[PDB]
Symmetry: D2
Subunit: 131 residues, 4 copies
Protein backbone atom coordinates (compact mmCIF):
# COMPACT_ATOMS: atom_id res chain seq x y z
CA UNK A 1 0.00 0.00 0.00
CA UNK A 2 0.97 3.66 -0.15
CA UNK A 3 3.19 5.37 2.37
CA UNK A 4 2.70 8.62 4.19
CA UNK A 5 5.05 11.55 3.86
CA UNK A 6 6.87 11.45 7.19
CA UNK A 7 8.87 14.17 8.92
CA UNK A 8 11.59 11.58 9.63
CA UNK A 9 11.91 10.82 5.95
CA UNK A 10 11.90 14.54 5.20
CA UNK A 11 14.85 15.32 7.46
CA UNK A 12 16.68 12.17 6.36
CA UNK A 13 16.68 13.77 2.92
CA UNK A 14 18.31 17.10 3.90
CA UNK A 15 21.87 17.51 2.61
CA UNK A 16 24.92 19.71 2.35
CA UNK A 17 25.99 19.70 -1.28
CA UNK A 18 29.61 19.64 -2.34
CA UNK A 19 30.13 20.28 -6.07
CA UNK A 20 31.59 17.23 -7.82
CA UNK A 21 34.10 19.42 -9.69
CA UNK A 22 35.87 20.03 -6.34
CA UNK A 23 37.16 16.47 -6.72
CA UNK A 24 38.16 16.61 -10.40
CA UNK A 25 39.51 20.12 -11.18
CA UNK A 26 43.19 20.98 -10.73
CA UNK A 27 42.06 24.43 -9.59
CA UNK A 28 40.26 22.93 -6.58
CA UNK A 29 42.95 20.35 -5.75
CA UNK A 30 44.27 22.53 -2.91
CA UNK A 31 40.91 22.56 -1.08
CA UNK A 32 40.81 20.76 2.27
CA UNK A 33 37.88 18.66 3.49
CA UNK A 34 36.83 21.53 5.74
CA UNK A 35 36.91 24.04 2.86
CA UNK A 36 34.64 21.83 0.75
CA UNK A 37 32.21 21.16 3.56
CA UNK A 38 32.14 24.85 4.56
CA UNK A 39 31.41 25.76 0.95
CA UNK A 40 28.41 23.37 0.99
CA UNK A 41 27.14 24.79 4.26
CA UNK A 42 27.35 28.35 2.99
CA UNK A 43 25.37 27.39 -0.11
CA UNK A 44 22.47 26.20 2.06
CA UNK A 45 22.84 29.49 3.84
CA UNK A 46 22.28 31.12 0.42
CA UNK A 47 18.68 30.34 0.86
CA UNK A 48 18.78 32.11 4.18
CA UNK A 49 20.35 35.19 2.48
CA UNK A 50 17.47 35.42 0.04
CA UNK A 51 15.10 35.51 3.01
CA UNK A 52 17.18 38.31 4.63
CA UNK A 53 16.96 40.42 1.45
CA UNK A 54 20.75 40.10 1.23
CA UNK A 55 20.60 40.56 -2.54
CA UNK A 56 22.58 43.37 -4.17
CA UNK A 57 21.73 45.70 -7.04
CA UNK A 58 22.50 43.13 -9.74
CA UNK A 59 20.61 40.38 -7.96
CA UNK A 60 23.75 38.82 -6.50
CA UNK A 61 23.07 37.01 -3.20
CA UNK A 62 25.46 37.69 -0.33
CA UNK A 63 26.21 37.13 3.36
CA UNK A 64 26.46 39.62 6.20
CA UNK A 65 28.07 37.39 8.80
CA UNK A 66 30.55 38.29 11.52
CA UNK A 67 33.53 35.98 12.05
CA UNK A 68 31.96 34.91 15.32
CA UNK A 69 28.73 34.00 13.54
CA UNK A 70 30.64 32.19 10.79
CA UNK A 71 32.47 30.30 13.53
CA UNK A 72 29.05 29.31 14.86
CA UNK A 73 27.74 28.31 11.42
CA UNK A 74 30.82 26.29 10.47
CA UNK A 75 31.55 24.89 13.95
CA UNK A 76 35.25 25.82 13.77
CA UNK A 77 37.89 27.81 15.66
CA UNK A 78 39.18 31.24 14.60
CA UNK A 79 42.36 29.98 12.89
CA UNK A 80 40.38 27.37 10.96
CA UNK A 81 37.87 30.00 9.88
CA UNK A 82 40.71 32.15 8.53
CA UNK A 83 42.29 29.20 6.70
CA UNK A 84 38.95 28.21 5.15
CA UNK A 85 38.17 31.77 4.11
CA UNK A 86 41.59 32.14 2.49
CA UNK A 87 41.40 28.79 0.72
CA UNK A 88 37.99 29.51 -0.80
CA UNK A 89 38.96 33.10 -1.63
CA UNK A 90 42.17 32.06 -3.42
CA UNK A 91 40.20 29.54 -5.52
CA UNK A 92 37.69 32.21 -6.50
CA UNK A 93 34.88 30.50 -4.59
CA UNK A 94 34.52 33.32 -2.03
CA UNK A 95 34.69 37.11 -2.55
CA UNK A 96 34.97 39.53 0.39
CA UNK A 97 33.69 43.10 0.08
CA UNK A 98 34.37 45.88 2.57
CA UNK A 99 31.67 48.56 2.84
CA UNK A 100 33.47 50.92 5.18
CA UNK A 101 33.11 52.34 8.67
CA UNK A 102 29.33 52.45 8.35
CA UNK A 103 28.83 48.76 7.51
CA UNK A 104 29.98 45.13 8.27
CA UNK A 105 31.86 43.08 5.65
CA UNK A 106 29.90 41.39 2.86
CA UNK A 107 30.62 37.82 1.75
CA UNK A 108 29.82 36.55 -1.75
CA UNK A 109 29.85 32.80 -2.36
CA UNK A 110 30.76 31.95 -5.95
CA UNK A 111 29.88 29.10 -8.34
CA UNK A 112 32.81 26.85 -9.39
CA UNK A 113 34.37 26.82 -12.85
CA UNK A 114 33.93 23.69 -14.96
CA UNK A 115 36.31 22.71 -17.78
CA UNK A 116 36.03 20.07 -20.46
CA UNK A 117 38.31 17.80 -18.44
CA UNK A 118 35.96 18.17 -15.47
CA UNK A 119 32.93 17.35 -17.60
CA UNK A 120 34.74 14.32 -19.05
CA UNK A 121 35.75 13.02 -15.61
CA UNK A 122 32.28 13.50 -14.11
CA UNK A 123 30.66 11.82 -17.14
CA UNK A 124 33.10 8.94 -16.70
CA UNK A 125 32.26 8.58 -13.01
CA UNK A 126 28.49 8.96 -13.44
CA UNK A 127 28.32 6.32 -16.19
CA UNK A 128 30.77 3.75 -14.82
CA UNK A 129 28.64 0.61 -15.21
CA UNK A 130 29.41 -3.05 -15.93
CA UNK A 131 29.83 -5.70 -17.49
Amino acid sequence: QNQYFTVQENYKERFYQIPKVFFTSENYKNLTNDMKIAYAILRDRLNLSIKNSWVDEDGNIYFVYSNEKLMEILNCKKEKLTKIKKGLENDGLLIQKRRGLNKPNILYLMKPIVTERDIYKIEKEENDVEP
Copy 2:
Protein backbone atom coordinates in the same frame (compact mmCIF):
# COMPACT_ATOMS: atom_id res chain seq x y z
CA GLN B 1 35.47 33.77 -14.46
CA ASN B 2 33.14 32.66 -11.68
CA GLN B 3 29.51 33.62 -11.46
CA TYR B 4 27.54 34.96 -8.54
CA PHE B 5 24.59 33.18 -7.04
CA THR B 6 21.69 35.29 -8.30
CA VAL B 7 18.13 35.50 -7.01
CA GLN B 8 16.92 35.27 -10.62
CA GLU B 9 18.74 32.00 -11.09
CA ASN B 10 17.41 30.80 -7.75
CA TYR B 11 13.76 31.33 -8.66
CA LYS B 12 14.32 30.00 -12.18
CA GLU B 13 15.20 26.73 -10.44
CA ARG B 14 12.00 26.37 -8.38
CA PHE B 15 9.72 23.56 -9.55
CA TYR B 16 6.53 21.62 -9.02
CA GLN B 17 7.42 17.95 -9.19
CA ILE B 18 5.20 15.38 -10.84
CA PRO B 19 6.25 11.77 -10.16
CA LYS B 20 7.36 10.01 -13.35
CA VAL B 21 5.34 6.91 -12.42
CA PHE B 22 2.14 8.96 -13.04
CA PHE B 23 2.97 8.56 -16.73
CA THR B 24 3.87 4.85 -16.72
CA SER B 25 1.62 3.04 -14.20
CA GLU B 26 -1.78 1.64 -15.21
CA ASN B 27 -3.02 2.65 -11.76
CA TYR B 28 -2.38 6.33 -12.52
CA LYS B 29 -3.64 6.21 -16.12
CA ASN B 30 -6.96 7.79 -15.10
CA LEU B 31 -5.28 10.92 -13.67
CA THR B 32 -5.96 14.18 -15.53
CA ASN B 33 -3.35 16.88 -16.13
CA ASP B 34 -4.91 18.92 -13.32
CA MET B 35 -4.76 15.98 -10.88
CA LYS B 36 -1.06 15.48 -11.56
CA ILE B 37 -0.23 19.16 -11.28
CA ALA B 38 -2.32 19.53 -8.10
CA TYR B 39 -0.49 16.56 -6.61
CA ALA B 40 2.85 18.30 -7.31
CA ILE B 41 1.64 21.55 -5.78
CA LEU B 42 0.45 19.82 -2.63
CA ARG B 43 3.85 18.14 -2.25
CA ASP B 44 5.57 21.53 -2.15
CA ARG B 45 2.96 22.45 0.40
CA LEU B 46 4.24 19.45 2.42
CA ASN B 47 7.12 21.59 3.37
CA LEU B 48 4.69 24.20 4.57
CA SER B 49 2.89 21.55 6.70
CA ILE B 50 6.11 20.68 8.49
CA LYS B 51 6.47 24.35 9.39
CA ASN B 52 2.87 24.42 10.72
CA SER B 53 3.57 21.42 12.98
CA TRP B 54 0.94 19.55 10.94
CA VAL B 55 2.61 16.23 11.78
CA ASP B 56 0.60 13.49 13.48
CA GLU B 57 1.53 11.01 16.20
CA ASP B 58 3.37 8.67 13.84
CA GLY B 59 5.22 11.50 12.14
CA ASN B 60 2.87 11.58 9.16
CA ILE B 61 2.66 15.05 7.57
CA TYR B 62 -0.80 16.39 6.78
CA PHE B 63 -2.84 19.37 5.58
CA VAL B 64 -5.49 21.38 7.38
CA TYR B 65 -6.91 23.27 4.41
CA SER B 66 -10.48 24.40 3.79
CA ASN B 67 -11.94 23.84 0.32
CA GLU B 68 -11.79 27.59 -0.21
CA LYS B 69 -8.10 27.63 0.67
CA LEU B 70 -7.44 24.61 -1.54
CA MET B 71 -9.24 26.46 -4.32
CA GLU B 72 -6.82 29.32 -3.72
CA ILE B 73 -3.76 27.05 -3.66
CA LEU B 74 -4.73 25.11 -6.78
CA ASN B 75 -6.28 28.04 -8.69
CA CYS B 76 -9.42 26.06 -9.58
CA LYS B 77 -13.22 26.23 -9.25
CA LYS B 78 -15.25 24.21 -6.74
CA GLU B 79 -16.29 21.45 -9.17
CA LYS B 80 -12.70 21.03 -10.35
CA LEU B 81 -11.50 20.84 -6.76
CA THR B 82 -13.99 18.05 -6.08
CA LYS B 83 -12.98 16.16 -9.24
CA ILE B 84 -9.28 16.46 -8.39
CA LYS B 85 -9.82 15.38 -4.79
CA LYS B 86 -11.82 12.34 -5.92
CA GLY B 87 -9.32 11.37 -8.60
CA LEU B 88 -6.36 11.47 -6.23
CA GLU B 89 -8.33 9.78 -3.45
CA ASN B 90 -9.46 6.90 -5.70
CA ASP B 91 -5.84 6.32 -6.78
CA GLY B 92 -4.69 6.21 -3.17
CA LEU B 93 -2.68 9.42 -3.54
CA LEU B 94 -4.89 11.42 -1.14
CA ILE B 95 -6.49 10.33 2.16
CA GLN B 96 -9.18 12.43 3.87
CA LYS B 97 -9.69 12.21 7.63
CA ARG B 98 -12.64 13.68 9.52
CA ARG B 99 -11.94 14.75 13.12
CA GLY B 100 -15.47 15.65 14.12
CA LEU B 101 -17.47 18.67 15.21
CA ASN B 102 -14.50 20.09 17.10
CA LYS B 103 -12.05 20.12 14.17
CA PRO B 104 -11.63 20.79 10.37
CA ASN B 105 -10.90 17.94 7.94
CA ILE B 106 -7.35 16.63 7.64
CA LEU B 107 -5.75 15.85 4.27
CA TYR B 108 -2.93 13.33 3.87
CA LEU B 109 -0.95 13.33 0.62
CA MET B 110 0.42 9.88 -0.21
CA LYS B 111 3.50 8.60 -2.08
CA PRO B 112 2.79 6.68 -5.32
CA ILE B 113 3.24 2.93 -5.74
CA VAL B 114 5.98 1.74 -8.09
CA THR B 115 5.95 -1.68 -9.79
CA GLU B 116 8.61 -3.52 -11.73
CA ARG B 117 6.97 -2.46 -14.98
CA ASP B 118 7.20 1.17 -13.84
CA ILE B 119 10.86 0.79 -12.94
CA TYR B 120 11.55 -0.85 -16.31
CA LYS B 121 9.76 1.90 -18.25
CA ILE B 122 11.48 4.72 -16.35
CA GLU B 123 14.89 3.04 -16.78
CA LYS B 124 14.14 2.75 -20.49
CA GLU B 125 13.20 6.42 -20.77
CA GLU B 126 16.10 7.70 -18.63
CA ASN B 127 18.71 5.75 -20.61
CA ASP B 128 17.38 6.21 -24.14
CA VAL B 129 20.61 7.30 -25.87
CA GLU B 130 22.02 6.85 -29.38
CA PRO B 131 23.64 5.68 -31.75
Copy 3:
Protein backbone atom coordinates in the same frame (compact mmCIF):
# COMPACT_ATOMS: atom_id res chain seq x y z
CA ASN C 1 18.57 1.43 10.08
CA GLN C 2 16.85 1.58 6.70
CA TYR C 3 18.10 0.38 3.32
CA PHE C 4 18.23 2.30 0.10
CA THR C 5 15.52 0.68 -2.01
CA VAL C 6 14.89 0.80 -5.75
CA GLN C 7 11.16 1.50 -5.20
CA GLU C 8 12.05 4.53 -3.10
CA ASN C 9 14.56 5.62 -5.75
CA TYR C 10 11.99 5.54 -8.58
CA LYS C 11 9.30 7.03 -6.35
CA GLU C 12 11.63 10.03 -6.25
CA ARG C 13 11.95 10.56 -10.00
CA PHE C 14 10.02 13.59 -11.26
CA TYR C 15 9.16 15.85 -14.17
CA GLN C 16 9.78 19.40 -13.06
CA ILE C 17 7.53 22.33 -14.01
CA PRO C 18 8.92 25.79 -13.20
CA LYS C 19 6.81 27.55 -10.61
CA VAL C 20 6.79 30.75 -12.69
CA PHE C 21 4.53 28.97 -15.20
CA PHE C 22 1.81 29.41 -12.59
CA THR C 23 2.61 32.96 -11.41
CA SER C 24 3.75 34.96 -14.44
CA GLU C 25 1.25 36.79 -16.62
CA ASN C 26 3.66 35.99 -19.43
CA TYR C 27 3.15 32.22 -19.20
CA LYS C 28 -0.58 32.41 -18.48
CA ASN C 29 -1.37 31.36 -22.06
CA LEU C 30 0.47 28.02 -21.66
CA THR C 31 -1.83 24.99 -21.48
CA ASN C 32 -1.32 22.07 -19.06
CA ASP C 33 0.04 19.95 -21.90
CA MET C 34 2.58 22.63 -22.76
CA LYS C 35 3.79 22.88 -19.15
CA ILE C 36 4.11 19.12 -18.79
CA ALA C 37 5.78 18.71 -22.19
CA TYR C 38 8.31 21.37 -21.17
CA ALA C 39 9.09 19.40 -17.97
CA ILE C 40 9.56 16.18 -19.95
CA LEU C 41 11.91 17.80 -22.47
CA ARG C 42 14.04 19.22 -19.62
CA ASP C 43 14.59 15.72 -18.30
CA ARG C 44 15.51 14.86 -21.85
CA LEU C 45 18.22 17.57 -21.57
CA ASN C 46 20.17 15.08 -19.62
CA LEU C 47 19.78 12.63 -22.46
CA SER C 48 21.04 15.26 -24.96
CA ILE C 49 24.24 15.70 -23.01
CA LYS C 50 24.82 11.96 -23.31
CA ASN C 51 24.14 12.13 -27.09
CA SER C 52 26.76 14.91 -27.57
CA TRP C 53 23.93 17.23 -28.60
CA VAL C 54 25.95 20.24 -27.43
CA ASP C 55 26.82 23.18 -29.68
CA GLU C 56 29.93 25.37 -29.82
CA ASP C 57 28.89 27.58 -26.92
CA GLY C 58 27.82 24.67 -24.74
CA ASN C 59 24.10 25.05 -25.43
CA ILE C 60 22.15 21.78 -25.16
CA TYR C 61 19.74 20.91 -27.96
CA PHE C 62 17.45 18.21 -29.34
CA VAL C 63 17.56 16.58 -32.75
CA TYR C 64 14.50 14.30 -32.46
CA SER C 65 12.22 13.44 -35.34
CA ASN C 66 8.56 14.41 -35.03
CA GLU C 67 7.70 10.71 -34.68
CA LYS C 68 10.17 10.48 -31.82
CA LEU C 69 8.81 13.60 -30.15
CA MET C 70 5.35 12.09 -30.50
CA GLU C 71 6.58 9.01 -28.65
CA ILE C 72 8.29 11.09 -25.94
CA LEU C 73 5.28 13.35 -25.33
CA ASN C 74 2.73 10.57 -25.99
CA CYS C 75 0.72 12.75 -28.38
CA LYS C 76 -0.53 12.88 -31.97
CA LYS C 77 1.02 15.15 -34.64
CA GLU C 78 -1.52 17.98 -34.32
CA LYS C 79 -0.94 18.15 -30.58
CA LEU C 80 2.84 18.18 -31.07
CA THR C 81 2.66 21.11 -33.46
CA LYS C 82 0.36 22.96 -31.07
CA ILE C 83 2.76 22.35 -28.16
CA LYS C 84 5.85 23.38 -30.15
CA LYS C 85 4.14 26.57 -31.29
CA GLY C 86 2.84 27.36 -27.81
CA LEU C 87 6.28 27.00 -26.22
CA GLU C 88 7.89 28.87 -29.12
CA ASN C 89 5.58 31.89 -28.76
CA ASP C 90 6.53 32.16 -25.10
CA GLY C 91 10.25 32.00 -25.85
CA LEU C 92 10.66 28.66 -24.12
CA LEU C 93 11.56 26.91 -27.35
CA ILE C 94 13.81 27.82 -30.27
CA GLN C 95 13.36 25.83 -33.48
CA LYS C 96 15.85 25.66 -36.37
CA ARG C 97 14.89 23.94 -39.63
CA ARG C 98 17.45 21.87 -41.54
CA GLY C 99 15.11 21.06 -44.42
CA LEU C 100 12.86 18.30 -45.70
CA ASN C 101 15.16 15.31 -45.02
CA LYS C 102 16.32 16.11 -41.49
CA PRO C 103 14.79 16.74 -38.07
CA ASN C 104 14.60 20.25 -36.65
CA ILE C 105 17.16 21.33 -34.09
CA LEU C 106 15.33 22.21 -30.87
CA TYR C 107 16.64 24.43 -28.09
CA LEU C 108 14.76 24.30 -24.82
CA MET C 109 14.95 27.64 -23.02
CA LYS C 110 14.90 28.74 -19.39
CA PRO C 111 11.87 30.86 -18.40
CA ILE C 112 11.99 34.57 -17.45
CA VAL C 113 11.59 35.50 -13.80
CA THR C 114 10.40 38.95 -12.74
CA GLU C 115 10.09 40.61 -9.34
CA ARG C 116 6.34 39.93 -9.40
CA ASP C 117 7.14 36.25 -9.99
CA ILE C 118 9.70 36.24 -7.18
CA TYR C 119 7.31 37.98 -4.79
CA LYS C 120 4.43 35.60 -5.52
CA ILE C 121 6.61 32.52 -5.22
CA GLU C 122 7.98 33.89 -1.91
CA LYS C 123 4.38 34.40 -0.81
CA GLU C 124 3.49 30.81 -1.74
CA GLU C 125 6.63 29.26 -0.26
CA ASN C 126 6.17 31.00 3.09
CA ASP C 127 2.40 30.61 3.41
CA VAL C 128 2.60 29.55 7.05
CA GLU C 129 0.40 29.66 10.15
CA PRO C 130 0.69 30.50 13.88
Copy 4:
Protein backbone atom coordinates in the same frame (compact mmCIF):
# COMPACT_ATOMS: atom_id res chain seq x y z
CA ASN D 1 16.03 33.98 -22.86
CA GLN D 2 18.85 31.77 -21.59
CA TYR D 3 20.03 28.41 -22.91
CA PHE D 4 20.57 25.23 -20.97
CA THR D 5 24.34 24.85 -20.93
CA VAL D 6 26.51 21.83 -20.17
CA GLN D 7 28.77 23.91 -17.86
CA GLU D 8 25.73 24.91 -15.82
CA ASN D 9 24.57 21.28 -15.79
CA TYR D 10 27.88 19.98 -14.38
CA LYS D 11 28.20 22.94 -12.03
CA GLU D 12 25.03 21.52 -10.49
CA ARG D 13 26.29 18.01 -9.81
CA PHE D 14 26.97 17.33 -6.13
CA TYR D 15 27.95 14.84 -3.47
CA GLN D 16 25.35 15.01 -0.74
CA ILE D 17 26.17 14.77 2.97
CA PRO D 18 23.16 14.34 5.29
CA LYS D 19 22.75 17.32 7.58
CA VAL D 20 22.29 15.03 10.59
CA PHE D 21 25.99 14.11 10.33
CA PHE D 22 26.62 17.58 11.74
CA THR D 23 23.85 17.73 14.37
CA SER D 24 23.49 14.26 15.89
CA GLU D 25 25.58 13.22 18.87
CA ASN D 26 25.43 9.76 17.31
CA TYR D 27 27.42 10.75 14.21
CA LYS D 28 29.82 13.06 16.06
CA ASN D 29 32.57 10.42 15.84
CA LEU D 30 32.51 10.42 12.01
CA THR D 31 35.55 12.08 10.41
CA ASN D 32 35.36 14.40 7.38
CA ASP D 33 36.62 11.59 5.14
CA MET D 34 33.88 9.29 6.40
CA LYS D 35 31.16 11.87 5.70
CA ILE D 36 32.46 12.60 2.21
CA ALA D 37 32.97 8.91 1.40
CA TYR D 38 29.36 8.27 2.45
CA ALA D 39 28.18 11.01 0.06
CA ILE D 40 30.21 9.53 -2.80
CA LEU D 41 28.86 6.01 -2.24
CA ARG D 42 25.28 7.34 -2.26
CA ASP D 43 25.83 8.76 -5.72
CA ARG D 44 27.19 5.35 -6.57
CA LEU D 45 23.78 3.97 -5.48
CA ASN D 46 22.51 5.16 -8.77
CA LEU D 47 25.25 3.20 -10.47
CA SER D 48 24.27 0.05 -8.51
CA ILE D 49 20.73 0.23 -9.80
CA LYS D 50 22.14 0.26 -13.34
CA ASN D 51 24.35 -2.78 -12.51
CA SER D 52 21.32 -4.80 -11.24
CA TRP D 53 22.89 -4.76 -7.77
CA VAL D 54 19.44 -5.08 -6.19
CA ASP D 55 18.50 -7.88 -3.80
CA GLU D 56 15.21 -9.75 -3.32
CA ASP D 57 13.64 -7.05 -1.17
CA GLY D 58 14.75 -4.22 -3.43
CA ASN D 59 17.72 -3.20 -1.30
CA ILE D 60 20.56 -1.59 -3.28
CA TYR D 61 24.09 -2.83 -2.65
CA PHE D 62 27.70 -2.61 -3.82
CA VAL D 63 29.96 -5.41 -4.97
CA TYR D 64 33.17 -3.43 -5.57
CA SER D 65 36.64 -4.80 -4.98
CA ASN D 66 38.82 -3.00 -2.46
CA GLU D 67 40.99 -1.77 -5.33
CA LYS D 68 37.89 -0.34 -6.96
CA LEU D 69 36.72 1.29 -3.74
CA MET D 70 40.20 2.78 -3.42
CA GLU D 71 39.80 4.29 -6.88
CA ILE D 72 36.28 5.59 -6.11
CA LEU D 73 37.26 7.16 -2.78
CA ASN D 74 40.76 8.15 -3.96
CA CYS D 75 42.41 6.64 -0.87
CA LYS D 76 44.98 4.04 0.17
CA LYS D 77 44.02 0.66 1.69
CA GLU D 78 44.51 1.68 5.33
CA LYS D 79 42.24 4.68 4.86
CA LEU D 80 39.60 2.53 3.16
CA THR D 81 39.52 0.08 6.04
CA LYS D 82 39.30 2.95 8.52
CA ILE D 83 36.40 4.50 6.58
CA LYS D 84 34.52 1.20 6.23
CA LYS D 85 34.90 0.50 9.95
CA GLY D 86 33.89 4.04 10.91
CA LEU D 87 30.70 3.93 8.83
CA GLU D 88 29.99 0.37 10.00
CA ASN D 89 30.20 1.30 13.70
CA ASP D 90 27.65 4.04 13.14
CA GLY D 91 25.25 1.71 11.33
CA LEU D 92 25.65 3.54 8.04
CA LEU D 93 27.28 0.55 6.39
CA ILE D 94 26.52 -3.17 6.41
CA GLN D 95 29.27 -5.50 5.19
CA LYS D 96 28.81 -9.14 4.14
CA ARG D 97 31.85 -11.32 3.40
CA ARG D 98 31.75 -13.85 0.57
CA GLY D 99 35.23 -15.21 1.23
CA LEU D 100 38.79 -14.90 -0.03
CA ASN D 101 38.09 -14.91 -3.79
CA LYS D 102 35.20 -12.46 -3.97
CA PRO D 103 34.46 -8.85 -3.03
CA ASN D 104 32.36 -8.02 0.01
CA ILE D 105 28.72 -7.10 -0.49
CA LEU D 106 28.20 -3.57 0.83
CA TYR D 107 24.90 -2.05 1.91
CA LEU D 108 24.85 1.70 2.36
CA MET D 109 22.35 2.70 5.03
CA LYS D 110 20.19 5.76 5.68
CA PRO D 111 21.06 7.69 8.86
CA ILE D 112 18.83 7.93 11.97
CA VAL D 113 17.01 11.18 12.63
CA THR D 114 15.85 12.15 16.12
CA GLU D 115 13.74 15.03 17.40
CA ARG D 116 16.91 16.79 18.56
CA ASP D 117 18.25 16.44 15.00
CA ILE D 118 15.00 17.74 13.54
CA TYR D 119 14.91 20.67 15.95
CA LYS D 120 18.52 21.70 15.28
CA ILE D 121 18.12 21.42 11.52
CA GLU D 122 14.91 23.50 11.77
CA LYS D 123 16.90 26.03 13.80
CA GLU D 124 19.64 26.14 11.15
CA GLU D 125 17.26 26.25 8.17
CA ASN D 126 15.26 29.14 9.60
CA ASP D 127 18.15 31.19 10.98
CA VAL D 128 16.77 34.46 9.61
CA GLU D 129 16.93 38.17 10.45
CA PRO D 130 14.59 41.19 10.69
